Amino acid sequence: KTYSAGVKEYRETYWMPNYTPKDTDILACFKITPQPGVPREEAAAAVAAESSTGTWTTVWTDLLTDLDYYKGRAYAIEDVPGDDTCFYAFIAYPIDLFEEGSVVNVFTSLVGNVFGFKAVRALRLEDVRFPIAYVMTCNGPPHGIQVERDILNKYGRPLLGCTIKPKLGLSAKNYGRAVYECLRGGLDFTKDDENVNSQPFMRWRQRFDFVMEAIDKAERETGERKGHYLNVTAPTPEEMYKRAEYAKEIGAPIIMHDYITGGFCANTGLAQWCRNNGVLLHIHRAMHAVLDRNPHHGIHFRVLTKILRLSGGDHLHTGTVVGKLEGDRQATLGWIDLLRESYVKEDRSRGIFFDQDWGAMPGAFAVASGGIHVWHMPALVTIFGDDSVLQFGGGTLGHPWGNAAGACANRVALEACIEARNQGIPIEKEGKEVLTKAAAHSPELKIAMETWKEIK
């Protein structure tokens, strides 16, 4: 090949319909809404070129290397079931293109600039196939589900949590009092809100201290291990590590990080720190809806789920299925599987375009939260199963008798649902009677059921 300056089309080089993906290739599925007049193959090849090695005009330095190997290539185009304004493009990238153990690098390469390319009206990254060879270069969850259950000595049920509310405004001691009441009521965890980092009304060191006081008192009172996700999200990595180190110093079993707003670099560093220091890592997905809500533009949350599992987290907020459509319900089940399972088979109904092998990388707890209460207990237990954390922020603090009673109501509802499920009862079909029979022995649960209306 010789050097010929000038602009050329992307289709002849970056569109290879006969390419067979290698077992080490990173595969990406892009739902492309192309600019009118642009053929599908040209749009797919443009996405591949701009995401891997392409440039808008021919450069001679290309001939110093093996572009035939290093380039990303579109190898398949499919129709989107239903919508005809867009199409699925499947692109393969050689593993050599990426820094090992760097979700930052893979993410930057895939989504760095193609979303603003003028050849497409809209672009959505639907799925990414991380080959097992690349997966093994990533740290993954610091502990994972089984190690976490062993650490916490909690088995056979979902864990129960609660975000302390109001999200902001409480002093450290009042915050700790709320934490203590929740934990003594029967919750496994309490949680800092995502925007609780270190505010003038509650500086982080004071919050950490009083939270640990609350945890110790609740553990002594109940005889069960307790935790509180101390938010270490911080302006700088030095501050984040300082807060994590203090949490370790005072004996905190678990910390929390906002991996999208804090960033993947800080999150990966924190996950490695958590592995090195034996601290559980709860991951909050703040800002996810900016990326994943729009069905035609952005990054689907299953990609963010894979990224988080590789970057590292022992828990990940996965959203609640309650009130979702069948397609959304299936997609949620799919990304829960991606978060927790060792191997996830391709399932177009779930939006899983690729088989995802995780090898021995442990899964993370799926976290359900957001406007849920006791009446949601059956569905949640049916949907998430045991390896999940169910978080009742308002559902615990909004109890008419306070945090301890609300925590007890949530715990009784969960344990009743779990026992009924173990006995073979169809819990989602008849959740009302299971909850009512439980409430016959739990006044807290009875008044909780009266506080919030049935959902169906």
Partner: protein
Amino acid sequence: MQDYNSSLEDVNSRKFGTFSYLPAMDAERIRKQVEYIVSKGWNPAIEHTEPEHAFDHYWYMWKLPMFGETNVDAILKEAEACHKAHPNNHVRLIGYDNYAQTKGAEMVIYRGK
């Protein structure tokens, strides 16, 4: 609006994991839990400990886990034997999941103290 009734001095405030916030299990509920463990293919096991040491990671194993045991009555009789040998101890029923290498189920079936 009532007080929650939990305190450091009240020994009834202590909880012992899954199903400890429900009424104490009777024979039929224990049998149903054993049946669930067997149906999952998990290996039944019995542990026990003095109530003061219930927080410990390791309880006393009652003999060995009944690996591959699917007879519900045999598991129940092993649990009853552990209860009789240590009447003051909490007795926990466990389903070991060897594929996940976790306890698929764990619950105190006999409350001590």
